[PDB]
Amino acid sequence: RQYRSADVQPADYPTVKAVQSMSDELNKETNGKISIKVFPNSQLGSEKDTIEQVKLGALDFIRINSGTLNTVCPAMTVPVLPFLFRDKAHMRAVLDGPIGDEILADCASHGLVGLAFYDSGARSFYATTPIRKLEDLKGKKIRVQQSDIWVSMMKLLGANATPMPAGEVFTGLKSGLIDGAENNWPSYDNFHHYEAAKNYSLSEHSMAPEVLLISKRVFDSFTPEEQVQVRKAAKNSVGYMRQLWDAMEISSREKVEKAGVEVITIDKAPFQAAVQPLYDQFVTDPKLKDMITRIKAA
């Protein structure tokens, strides 16, 4: 059985290679019984639409950002929150441990089994003009993921959110529909956004990680041994992914700088102050508020 998985990222991207590595492991351990074919580059649809396919059992696996998954699974809002993690090492420790496992377990009741977190760096603003301070964002049309938290966030920052699928963003930057967007270094590179919006400002305002999930309907068809094998292959793929990822952050930043991008250092304090209301607005469950307390102290 060759199961199917979706990713908006290109064929050679670390998230795609990670799931392919998981497939290789499963193919070996199950002696051909289970493998996974990845369909990259939004071939199967947007993140919004592919998450619905998984809920319906129309799609077996999905690799999506938590910043869209949190439309369905409330716990996924927690790791999206701006300025929550101190740095990459803090995030990795949290997501690899009990807190990460607790968040992944939240998805099952919604028809999706959470299997692993993949790194996504920190998301930063980029635009067709240089954003040198928060005030420079005022009135700008900034694309966000199709998830309400980001609309609220842009409002607090004085910008105008335009939610749209990942595959439409380059076109919007070239057409004038949007003035900018926000993402990590490998995405700024690999979606070609740097060609159209040549000013990248290190706001580092979210570390929203990626999530790999399986349809609950499909998972439930697996033997108990197969379920253990799938979870273990998913966890093993995190370390594989991270090695590819850390190199790509370097090579992508180098590539776009060579192409003429201005990399802008920006005072984050006004951003942090502006977005604080999001925490109580979007995280209302006492269990999740306690989780945030534990994360802040980890």
135, interface contact from ligand GTR, Cl ion, none, CB < 5-8 Å by kind: Cl ion
Strand 123-127 relative to strand 180-183, pairing: antiparallel
Using Cβ positions, the residue closest to ligand GTR within the complex turns out to be 65
Angle between helices 98-105 and 286-296 (to 10 degrees): 150
206, interface contact from ligand GTR, Cl ion, none, CB < 5-8 Å by kind: none
Using Cβ positions, the residue closest to Cl ion within the complex turns out to be 135
183, interface contact from ligand GTR, Cl ion, none, CB < 5-8 Å by kind: ligand GTR
- Annotate 191-260 with three-state secondary structure: CCHHHCCCEEEEEEEECCCEEEEEEHHHHHHCCHHHHHHHHHHHHHHHHHHHHHHHHHHHHHHHHHHHCC
Which residue in the block uniquely carries the two structure tokens 């996974």?
36
> Residues 178, 169: contact at Cβ < 8 Å?
yes
- Distance, in Å, from the CA atom of 199 to the CA atom of 193, rounded to the nearest integer, reads 10
Whether 102 has a binding-site annotation, put simply, is no
- Distance, in Å, from the CA atom of 170 to the CA atom of 228, rounded to the nearest integer, reads 40
Contacts of 175 (CB under 8 A, 6+ apart): none
120, interface contact from ligand GTR, Cl ion, none, CB < 5-8 Å by kind: ligand GTR
Nearer to ligand GTR, 67 or 74 (CB): 67
Whether 253 has a binding-site annotation, put simply, is no
To ligand GTR, the closest distance from the beta carbon of 183 in angstroms equals: 5
233, interface contact from Cl ion, ligand GTR, none, CB < 5-8 Å by kind: none
Please give the residue ranges that form the binding site for Cl ion (CB under 5 A). Answer: 46-47, 133-135, 165-166
Whether 210 has a binding-site annotation, put simply, is yes
Nearer to ligand GTR, 70 or 120 (CB): 120
For residue 150, what are the CA distances in angstroms to 97, 160, 205? 27, 10, 11
Nearer to ligand GTR, 184 or 203 (CB): 184
Whether 160 has a binding-site annotation, put simply, is no
Neighbours of 21 (CB within 10 A): 17
Strand 262-264 relative to strand 199-206, pairing: parallel
To Cl ion, the closest distance from the beta carbon of 267 in angstroms equals: 7
To ligand GTR, the closest distance from the beta carbon of 187 in angstroms equals: 4
Nearer to ligand GTR, 162 or 187 (CB): 187
To ligand GTR, the closest distance from the beta carbon of 166 in angstroms equals: 3
252, interface contact from ligand GTR, Cl ion, none, CB < 5-8 Å by kind: none
**CA-CA-CA-CA dihedral for 58, 221, 21, 185, to nearest 10:** 40
Total residue length of the chain: 298
Whether 190 has a binding-site annotation, put simply, is no
- Distance, in Å, from the CA atom of 271 to the CA atom of 212, rounded to the nearest integer, reads 30
Please give the residue ranges that form the binding site for ligand GTR (CB under 6 A). Answer: 8-9, 47, 64-65, 67-68, 120, 145, 166, 183-184, 187, 210
Nearer to Cl ion, 86 or 133 (CB): 133
- Distance, in Å, from the CA atom of 20 to the CA atom of 258, rounded to the nearest integer, reads 31
Residue ranges of the binding site: 9, 47, 63, 123, 143, 183-184, 210
Residue ranges of the binding site for beta-D-galacturonate: 9, 47, 63, 123, 143, 183-184, 210
